[PDB]
Design a protein around this ligand. Sequence first.
Ligand code: KWX
Length: 133
Amino acid sequence: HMCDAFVGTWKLVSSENFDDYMKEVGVGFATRKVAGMAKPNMIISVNGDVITIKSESTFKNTEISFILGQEFDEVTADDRKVKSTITLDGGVLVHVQKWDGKSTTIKRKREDDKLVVECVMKGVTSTRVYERA
Ligand SMILES: O=C(Nc1ccc(F)c(Cl)c1)[C@H]1CCCC[C@H]1C(=O)O
């Protein structure tokens, strides 16, 4: 029942500062433009201890499955090969990605009827807001 409030199908309704976040991450121009246009569906499900997060969009479809606290390999939508660890901290899913001596942290939280995603790469934060589909 750990992530019950996250489970479901969510649609992107707002994005702020995503281009700047992607710049800081090292995403090149053409990927930034196309990825920044995407309006993904996020699908979160749980089966036992395994959490699955899918993103479906016109740009890329991605899927990760993981157990909290247990590192895994992830190929991101922008084609980074990262080492990821996701934990629950005070009801917030905290996802850290490590690659090439760099790190970014993505937090996913339930706030009212929204799922709020905050992405940080050094000093730069982007906020992406999802509602139920
Ligand atoms: O955006 C994401 N994934 C994702 C997948 C497939 C795509 F095509 C595009 Cl563009 C993005 C997540 C990962 C990076 C930070 C924001 C997160 C989110 O909003 O759900």
